[PDB]
Amino acid sequence: RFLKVKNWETEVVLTDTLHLKSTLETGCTEYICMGSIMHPATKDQLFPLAKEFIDQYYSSIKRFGSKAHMERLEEVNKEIDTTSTYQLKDTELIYGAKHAWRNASRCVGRIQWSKLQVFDARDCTTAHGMFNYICNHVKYATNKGNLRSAITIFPQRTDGKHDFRVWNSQLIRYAGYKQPDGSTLGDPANVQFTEICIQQGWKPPRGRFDVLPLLLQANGNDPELFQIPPELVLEVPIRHPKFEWFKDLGLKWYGLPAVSNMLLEIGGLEFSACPFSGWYMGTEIGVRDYCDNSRYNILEEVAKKMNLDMRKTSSLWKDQALVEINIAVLYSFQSDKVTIVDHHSATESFIKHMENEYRCRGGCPADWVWIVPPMSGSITPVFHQEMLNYRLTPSFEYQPDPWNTHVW
Amino acid sequence: CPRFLKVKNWETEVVLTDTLHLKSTLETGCTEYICMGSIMHPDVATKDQLFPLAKEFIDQYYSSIKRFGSKAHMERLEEVNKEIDTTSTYQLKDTELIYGAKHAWRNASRCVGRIQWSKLQVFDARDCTTAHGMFNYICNHVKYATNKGNLRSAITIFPQRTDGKHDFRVWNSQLIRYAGYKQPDGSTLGDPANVQFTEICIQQGWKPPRGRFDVLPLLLQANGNDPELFQIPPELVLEVPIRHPKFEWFKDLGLKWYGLPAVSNMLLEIGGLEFSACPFSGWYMGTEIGVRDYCDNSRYNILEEVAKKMNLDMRKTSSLWKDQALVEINIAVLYSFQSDKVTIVDHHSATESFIKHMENEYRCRGGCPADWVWIVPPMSGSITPVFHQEMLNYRLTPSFEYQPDPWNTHVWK
Numbered sequence: 001r002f003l004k005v006k007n008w009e010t011e012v013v014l015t016d017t018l019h020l021k022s023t024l025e026t027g028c029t030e031y032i033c034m035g036s037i038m039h040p041a042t043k044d045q046l047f048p049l050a051k052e053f054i055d056q057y058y059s060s061i062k063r064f065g066s067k068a069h070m071e072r073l074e075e076v077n078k079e080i081d082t083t084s085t086y087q088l089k090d091t092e093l094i095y096g097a098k099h100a101w102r103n104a105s106r107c108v109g110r111i112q113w114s115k116l117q118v119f120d121a122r123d124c125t126t127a128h129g130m131f132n133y134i135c136n137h138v139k140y141a142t143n144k145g146n147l148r149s150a151i152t153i154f155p156q157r158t159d160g161k162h163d164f165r166v167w168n169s170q171l172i173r174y175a176g177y178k179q180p181d182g183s184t185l186g187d188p189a190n191v192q193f194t195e196i197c198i199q200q201g202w203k204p205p206r207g208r209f210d211v212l213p214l215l216l217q218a219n220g221n222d223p224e225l226f227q228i229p230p231e232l233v234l235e236v237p238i239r240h241p242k243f244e245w246f247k248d249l250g251l252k253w254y255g256l257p258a259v260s261n262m263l264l265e266i267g268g269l270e271f272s273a274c275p276f277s278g279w280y281m282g283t284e285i286g287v288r289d290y291c292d293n294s295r296y297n298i299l300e301e302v303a304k305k306m307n308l309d310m311r312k313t314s315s316l317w318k319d320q321a322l323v324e325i326n327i328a329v330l331y332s333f334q335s336d337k338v339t340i341v342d343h344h345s346a347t348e349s350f351i352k353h354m355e356n357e358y359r360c361r362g363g364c365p366a367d368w369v370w371i372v373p374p375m376s377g378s379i380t381p382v383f384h385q386e387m388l389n390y391r392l393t394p395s396f397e398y399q400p401d402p403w404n405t406h407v408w
Numbered sequence: 409c410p411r412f413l414k415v416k417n418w419e420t421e422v423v424l425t426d427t428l429h430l431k432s433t434l435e436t437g438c439t440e441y442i443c444m445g446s447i448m449h450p451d452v453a454t455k456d457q458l459f460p461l462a463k464e465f466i467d468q469y470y471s472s473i474k475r476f477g478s479k480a481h482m483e484r485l486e487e488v489n490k491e492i493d494t495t496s497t498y499q500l501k502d503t504e505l506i507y508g509a510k511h512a513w514r515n516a517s518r519c520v521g522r523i524q525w526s527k528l529q530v531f532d533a534r535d536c537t538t539a540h541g542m543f544n545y546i547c548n549h550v551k552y553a554t555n556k557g558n559l560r561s562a563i564t565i566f567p568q569r570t571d572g573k574h575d576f577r578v579w580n581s582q583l584i585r586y587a588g589y590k591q592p593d594g595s596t597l598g599d600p601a602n603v604q605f606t607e608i609c610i611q612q613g614w615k616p617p618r619g620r621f622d623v624l625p626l627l628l629q630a631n632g633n634d635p636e637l638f639q640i641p642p643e644l645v646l647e648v649p650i651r652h653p654k655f656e657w658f659k660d661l662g663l664k665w666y667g668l669p670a671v672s673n674m675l676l677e678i679g680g681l682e683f684s685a686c687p688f689s690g691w692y693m694g695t696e697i698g699v700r701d702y703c704d705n706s707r708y709n710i711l712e713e714v715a716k717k718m719n720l721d722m723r724k725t726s727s728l729w730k731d732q733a734l735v736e737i738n739i740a741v742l743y744s745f746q747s748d749k750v751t752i753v754d755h756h757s758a759t760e761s762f763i764k765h766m767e768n769e770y771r772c773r774g775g776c777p778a779d780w781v782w783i784v785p786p787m788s789g790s791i792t793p794v795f796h797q798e799m800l801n802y803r804l805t806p807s808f809e810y811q812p813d814p815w816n817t818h819v820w821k
């Protein structure tokens with residue numbers, strides 16, 4: 001059936017037909033909704049997946065049922081027969097990577113989806129090769145602060161014993177240190193990964209903003225440590241446009257957000273190493289990174305310097321410090337001409353993207369739980385936007401952390 | 409469905425196990441292929457439909473009072489069955505009515521306030537026959553619940569649906585709300601959310617004061633008859649003028665709000681019985697006023713004027729002038745209610761209580777259905793503990809349900 005979505009602020013109603021093309025599961029049933037749960041091959045399994053993807057690629061370039069389409073189908077059939085897998089054409093890899101982003105229901109940045117620079121790294125064989133490819137990615141995507149979206153695609157999975165993996169969760173992240181007296185120096189989300197890097201020989205500077213090394217696994221071998229050359233790592237000192245004391249907090253962040261632990265699935269092929277990057281929405285730094293209780297957890301210090309009354313929650317001192325921290329982040333990036341988007345502009349772009357996708361595509365899968373920003377929700381337009389969530393492929397998927405599967 | 413489902417809290421690592429979902433009744437709207445978790449809304453029962461629904465409820469009640477399988481349980485089952493057989497309906501006992509109303513609240517997955525569910529004063533109004541009598545019951549409800557500002561949660565339950573042509577309905581969406589007036593020039597005076605109902609009231613004979621904060625009259629329908637208008641005695645409408653602890657100029661905005669939030673348009677379903685008029689009230693979380701009522705664009709929409717008085721740069725969104733004004737507005741709302749000693753809860757306290765409540769429910773009941781989209785507050789979401797809490801949503805009965813607006817269905821006499 002067709003399905004309608006209503007925006008309760010504008011009363012606009014859209015009609016979804018695209019959900020009829022989905023086949024992966026959501027996790028919900030008719031009786032239980034799992035919308036706030038974070039995470040709910042063979043020759044036989046492969047060809048229908050390959051066929052569907054080839055079909056939708058040739059349907060996208062409007063040569064469905066063409067000789068090129070027919071020949072590709074047979075070419076893929078023979079290749080799965082004689083090798084239990086197949087290799088994408090370059091054109092298909094690019095189309096598949098752009099559409100995995102287009103289909104990412106949790107991403108508010110998707111208005112940019114067709115401006116994605118796709119780096120083909122399928123000829124890589126070693127961790128040194130991966131490091132080279134990744135340095136080139138970081139340099140290209142950073143672009144002296146004028147950030148450019150990019151993805152680098154390493155060889156696909158074969159037997160599951162020869163996986164390519166970036167062990168880092170992001171290419172650029174700060175270390176976290178388990179202090180003797182109990183607390184945490186640096187970034188507490190990375191304590192385990194930091195300790196794995198130390199355990200592999202990394203000499204930790206034990207600062208607050210230590211860029212972690214890359215830990216890279218090629219063809220299922222043990223992973224190897226590499227230091228990203230510092231001139232490739234663009235950072236922003238965080239200051240406030242009114243509180244001159246804000247800089248004395250000693251805060252900084254990196255400009256390049258680059259997810260490196262997800263899995264890219266295209267036509268039944270699995271790309272276990274596919275680091276991809278864009279640019280930040282300011283709340284990603286200022287709300288979650290800085291203010292989660294299990295993260296940098298700085299709200300108390302900021303509220304202190306603002307001299308806010310912190311004895312009762314109903315003074316909303318936490319909410320006041322939260323806004324100022326996010327003003328500082330946005331101000332700092334813009335002052336340094338590092339690409340960044342505020343949650344008001346981003347959500348506005350996403351509503352416009354939604355309208356575009358409903359018109360030209362018949363829908364847009366979207367995860368309200370993730371699309372609504374972690375602060376000032378209902379004063380952004382996505383709060384009032386009903387969204388249908390469903391799984392379209394090509395897609396990005398979660399995968400296990402490699403230190404739970406790897407045999408040394 | 410699997411017998412155990414786990415939810416995780418990503419801030420604390422606590423993992424809870426849900427078995428209560430196995431008692432789920434109606435549908436969520438979701439399927440295996442599509443999730444409708446952000447969709448806001450995703451002829452009577454026959455004898456045959458009513459038998460099993462009543463038995464399920466009666467079984468649950470006698471299980472709650474530790475008398476399952478007892479002689480009184482089996483007798484009640486038989487008495488209900490005969491009554492459905494000979495009359496096509498049945499009547500709840502007072503004890504069952506109170507149990508059912510409390511559990512409809514306990515089961516309300518969108519309510520962050522459910523730690524209080526067992527302290528609900530239930531007013532039995534099933535003897536009511538006329539709209540005047542409905543007025544009397546509602547006045548007593550408002551007075552009791554307001555309690556000079558020390559608010560107490562309460563529900564008043566009017567007679568159940570019979571053939572659907574004799575419904576009791578409160579046409580108001582809440583017992584206390586402010587009028588909205590569309591102007592010829594397109595502007596709105598008062599609360600833009602209530603323009604449709606205000607016009608209906610005016611058409612029914614209400615003389616509007618045409619101000620910014622005019623308490624709407626009650627529009628009350630008894631036994632399926634045409635609805636009738638009543639003015640709530642103004643001394644029963646407790647109100648709070650909004651002022652700011654720092655900004656002296658804030659009181660010059662002339663803002664105020666009423667103290668009692670009281671939903672009156674929902675349907676209470678108990679044992680297959682349908683209570684189409686069941687107004688219920690609690691106390692406010694501050695953001696319901698300071699964020700939604702005041703700062704929604706289609707509501708009072710005061711962000712601009714507050715930002716002006718704060719002298720914020722309103723040309724770049726990246727200045728976060730909206731976010732900064734929204735906080736001060738919510739500071740004022742909480743400060744003004746606490747100063748006048750009118751019960752109110754800030755969003756940090758309410759969400760922390762709800763997490764404690766949810767953990768207790770998981771431990772002692774086997775789960776707690778919760779709608780994350782509604783539980784997370786509309787400001788500062790991720791610095792509240794519910795943001796990081798995985799929740800399972802499912803529909804248990806007894807329940808509160810939405811129902812059509814009565815002017816769309818009423819057969820005018």
Ligand code: HEM
Nearest residue numbers: 101104106107108109112149151276277278279280281396
């Ligand atoms: C171009 C600027 C971009 C912006 C502003 C943006 C914004 C965001 C934000 C704010 C989130 C939520 C992140 C979180 O809460 O952890 C997100 C998620 C996501 N983004 Fe985008 N993004 C951008 C680019 C991209 C690109 C280039 C890709 C892939 C090629 C991508 C794929 C995803 C995916 C898969 C998720 C879901 C992550 C998960 O499930 O954990 N995004 N995005």
Ligand code: HEM
Nearest residue numbers: 513516518519520521524561562688689690691692693808
């Ligand atoms: C006692 C203090 C209470 C607090 C702090 C509270 C808090 C809330 C809040 C913040 C919401 C979301 C409101 C919105 O965004 O419109 C809500 C919804 C709800 N509450 Fe509670 N509530 C309380 C009492 C009650 C009582 C006494 C009942 C019923 C007996 C109840 C039943 C509901 C229901 C059914 C909803 C969902 C309404 C809908 O979907 O439109 N609440 N509550």
Ligand SMILES: Cc1cc(N)nc(CCc2c(F)c(F)cc(CCCN(C)C)c2F)c1
Nearest residue numbers: 170173257258259276277278279280281289
């Ligand atoms: C391409 C892109 C652009 C953009 N603006 N944001 C993203 C999301 C980033 C991102 C994830 F995808 C994710 F799964 C988890 C985290 C956790 C926070 C870790 N952080 C402290 C280092 C995260 F930040 C991606």
Ligand SMILES: Cc1cc(N)nc(CCc2c(F)c(F)cc(CCCN(C)C)c2F)c1
Nearest residue numbers: 581582601669671688689690691692693701
């Ligand atoms: C008992 C109780 C206590 C509390 N604190 N909150 C609530 C929920 C409030 C609530 C609804 F659930 C609802 F469906 C509709 C409205 C009216 C419009 C809302 N707003 C646009 C004015 C309403 F006020 C109930």
Ligand SMILES: C[C@H](O)[C@H](O)[C@H]1CNc2nc(N)[nH]c(=O)c2N1
Nearest residue numbers: 383384385386446447448781782
């Ligand atoms: C479209 C979306 O479902 C809608 O805006 C919902 C979102 N969550 C909400 N949450 C609460 N508490 N109240 C609401 O009115 C809404 N509105």
Ligand SMILES: C[C@H](O)[C@H](O)[C@H]1CNc2nc(N)[nH]c(=O)c2N1
Nearest residue numbers: 036037038369370795796797798
């Ligand atoms: C429990 C809940 O699913 C979890 O906290 C989610 C909620 N929404 C989110 N939304 C975004 N953008 N990022 C997140 O990490 C989360 N976490």
Ligand SMILES: [Zn+2]
Nearest residue numbers: 028033438443
């Ligand atoms: Zn769902």
